[PDB]
Structure 1
Amino acid sequence: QKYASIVGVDLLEEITKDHKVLARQQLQVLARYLKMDLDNGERKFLKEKDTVAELQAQLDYLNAELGEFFVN
């Protein structure tokens, strides 16, 4: 816009999905060639979690029984 002000010169898809799935497929079969779990990167993420809820469920019993004044 600055250059024009200074000069003056103004003015379907499914083709893909398949093109994906094989990748999505050749993906997994490869893992078998290396035995490389693509879910361990989540199970951690879930056990890190279930342990949390309970970790917390403890933590809030206290704030409920004792009080945030006491605790803090």
Structure 2
Amino acid sequence: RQQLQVLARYLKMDLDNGERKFLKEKDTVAELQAQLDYLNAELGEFFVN
């Protein structure tokens, strides 16, 4: 693991970049799902469908 981290540092490779983007996108999913849940609580399942 230490050798891999050294090589990643040399290569300027961000091993955590994909994970960071994934958590940002998961937060975006949560916020869009919150909006959809609000619209569903508001109009109802029948209306939205």
TM range (shorter): over 0.9
The answer for unaligned runs of 5 or more in structure 1 is 1-23
Normalization by structure 1: what TM-score?
Answer: 0.65
Relative to its length, the structure with more helix (as a share) is 2
Higher relative contact order (CA 8 A, sep 6+): 2
Q: Which has the larger radius of gyration?
A: 1
- The runs of at least 4 consecutive aligned structure 1 residues that moved more than 6 Å come to none
Unaligned ranges ≥5, structure 2: none
- Paired residue total: 49
Please, what TM-score do these two structures have when normalized by structure 2? 0.93
| Root-mean-square deviation (Å) | 0.6
